[PDB]
Amino acid sequence: NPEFMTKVGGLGATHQADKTVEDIVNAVKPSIQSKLGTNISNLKVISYKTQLVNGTNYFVKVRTENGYAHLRIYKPFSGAASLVSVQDGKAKDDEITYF
């Protein structure tokens, strides 16, 4: 159950897109392009949740010309972020849940 795993993982509240997360998304844009298989030149960051780990996992709702997707992006305390996984084919209002 996605709601249950979101509790187990300790994801927080949904936050408005901000500069910190936009920079993280930009850092992993080549991987997003490959995973979403579409032109993401005008990708828009919508919102996100986080998990506090050794570093931070960001669960990010993004919008492209192909629709919405959720991204799991790992940011170590020191060093650039990396894309872990995606949930493609999301709706605008879908809850950000753990995956």
| Number of domain units in the chain | 1
Full domain range(s) for residue 27: 1-99
Q: Are 66 and 55 in contact (CB under 8 A)?
A: no
Nearest to residue 86, comparing CAs of 39, 42, 25, 41? 25
Strand order in the sheet with 82-90: 15-16, 44-53, 55-64, 67-75, 82-90
d(CA 96, CA 38): 21
Annotated resolution, angstroms: 1.1
Residue 31 is encoded by which pair of tokens?
């991987």
d(CA 72, CA 86): 6
Helices (H), the chain: 2-8, 19-27, 29-36
